């Protein structure tokens, strides 16, 4: 029994709830529960001088009697099938704030949110709440997109094969332990693929140092991802036919190799730690172009900003 | 001679630059020079135990002297025309700020940036630097649509008529000011609006509070609005015919109208200041509807977070 305590980030702008739907699923093949979640506000509420407290209060209390019922009612489905869902809609007025609070004081395992994808060849779109989330959510963030899944969808954990500090070894660990472990509670026979990618070097020679050749220097780093790919590979009983490791810039490689490989989802490690800064760079453009759902993981050792 | 110094933020993931389109029909109209900017970094840089910090030097030197050349061509006809263009490629990986940075160490007047729409009927999409930018940019930020502006497009300014404190009439006023002057600076015959939108009370009684009607804080909201939006009109020469004042949620609202109004551009004033929390949440949600050009633009108060 794990990843039994899910938390669905409800979407406010519309009836149907993918977010909703994706625990459910979860939860008839894992067990557990879903608390779906909505942080309310009102103009109203600031409108201090024109507006009395109890003609405030009055108004916070309509907003969230009439949310809740909202959320009930599409929920009522799942409900009458035995699905546990707790409805938690509260007064806040910085959504971002509030989600993260309520992971951290309920220890949910997972955060689900979905994200809307207008075309097929299309991009997902990240709100800027969305974006608070990635950045700052210490769970695992999970965004849906808000279509069906591909069938006989893969799942795709791209690594970080390439900068040297010894946390991301430990990062992609905990993502391909992760990946194999959710994976396996929810699919019958799940389809796990690694991934990396590198770029090369932005020069044929340089100047002030003759012996220098840096054809030799992309070939050095196509080796060490080759080494660590076949070490994760051997540790998570991965077929050396489901790895690739791919040259060229990450952003528009991990997403193209995603879309080659009829993902359903990537699996990412994202960082708080400020400096790194170049890795929050490149992952924010990777991100920004996935085509599919994707699954973010901070490491162990992460510091959420928010605090209760 | 005001608004003299411009920024443009170079896109680095295409060659037409709108955002410097857009800066030369500016200085063509109302004199000044422009900096086309952009921060460059590469993985190359963080590989410190497989690479010397010659050769990574040799490789930084490379991808400065190559964007370098690659901007002065997209540039090379309006320096021919005699625009003073001044580029500038640093290496920093954290592009928020250096941009932010360069806006204060230079003291820009403005700084332009392109944001992709893709359909006609369509968001701009923005991306996580442009939320950073919009959020922290001390300077008045622009955010330039990658279309072309419509023959007798519209000015907006989107005023807020409903907040209590005293600190919005302000920013209003500085939103209007300097709509008038920068318009007339470039246009012949800038055609002007002023627009507000109030949101209804979410209750239609109180039970708690038996002679409370909310219909007459729907009203008394209304005639606030209407009594700002005259004296506004009034202070800056703005025909009544050319004012709206209108229900509804703003951030559904004001991208509706400024549609309906054929609008080139909304401007829109934003804050720094934490708590009048909800607005950020409001203006965010605007911002991310919008299907027309942005010119947002802060308070005189102003803190930036960052500092150099
Ligand atoms: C390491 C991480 C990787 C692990 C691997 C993860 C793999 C995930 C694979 C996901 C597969 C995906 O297809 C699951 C899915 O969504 O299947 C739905 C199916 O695509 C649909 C159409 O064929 O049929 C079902 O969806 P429906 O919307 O038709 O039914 P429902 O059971 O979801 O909803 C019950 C009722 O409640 C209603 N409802 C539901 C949500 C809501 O917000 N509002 C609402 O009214 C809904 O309209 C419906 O009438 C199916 N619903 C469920 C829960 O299985
Ligand atoms: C309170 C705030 C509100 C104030 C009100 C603001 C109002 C703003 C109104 C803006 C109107 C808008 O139409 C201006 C505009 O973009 O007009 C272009 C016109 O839409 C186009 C097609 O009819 O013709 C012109 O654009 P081109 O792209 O054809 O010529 P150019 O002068 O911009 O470029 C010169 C050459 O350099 C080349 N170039 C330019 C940019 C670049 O990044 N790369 C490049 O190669 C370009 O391809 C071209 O061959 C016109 N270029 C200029 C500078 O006027
Ligand atoms: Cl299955
Ligand atoms: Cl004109």
């Known amino acids: ?53 109890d003609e405030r209060n009055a108004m916070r209390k309509g907003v969230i009697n009439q949310k809740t019922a909202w959320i009930k009612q599409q929920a009522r489905y799942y409900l009458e099938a035995g699905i546990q869902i707790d409805i938690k809609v509260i007064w806040h007025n910085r959504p971002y ?4 609070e309520e992971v951290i004081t309920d220890k949910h395992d997972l955060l689900i949110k979905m ?34 899944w591909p069938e006989y969808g893969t799942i795709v954990v791209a690594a970080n094969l390439s900068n040297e500090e010894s946390y991301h070894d430990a990062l992609n660990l905990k993502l391909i332990e992760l990946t194999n472990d959710l994976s396996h509670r929810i699919q019958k026979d799940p389809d796990v693929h690694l991934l990396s990618a590198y770029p090369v070097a932005p020069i044929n020679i340089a100047i002030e140092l003759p012996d220098f050749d840096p054809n030799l ?34 952003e528009q490689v991990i997403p193209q190799v995603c879309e080659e490989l009829n993902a359903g989802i990537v699996v990412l490690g994202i960082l708080g730690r400020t400096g790194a ?32």
């Open 1 to 53: 029994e794990k990843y039994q305590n899910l938390l669905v980030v409800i979407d406010p702008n519309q009836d149907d709830q993918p977010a909703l739907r994706r625990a459910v699923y979860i939860v008839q093949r894992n067990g557990g529960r879903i608390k779906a979640f909505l942080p309310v506000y009102d103009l109203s509420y600031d409108m201090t001088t024109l507006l009395s407290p």
């Open 217 to 250: 220097y992309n070939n050095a780093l196509r080796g060490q991802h080759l080494i660590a790919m076949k070490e994760l590979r051997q540790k998570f009983s991965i077929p050396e036919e489901k790895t690739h490791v791919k040259e060229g810039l990450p």
């Open 97 to 100: 704030e509030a989600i993260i």
């Open 277 to 308: 800064a170049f890795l929050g760079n490149t992952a924010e453009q990777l991100i920004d172009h996935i085509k599919c759902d994707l699954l973010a993981i901070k490491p162990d050792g992460f510091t959420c900003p928010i605090t209760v």
């Open 115 to 148: 994200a809307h994808q207008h075309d097929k060849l299309g991009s997902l779109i990240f709100t800027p709440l969305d974006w608070q989330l990635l950045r700052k959510c210490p769970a695992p963030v999970w965004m849906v997109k808000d279509k069906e």
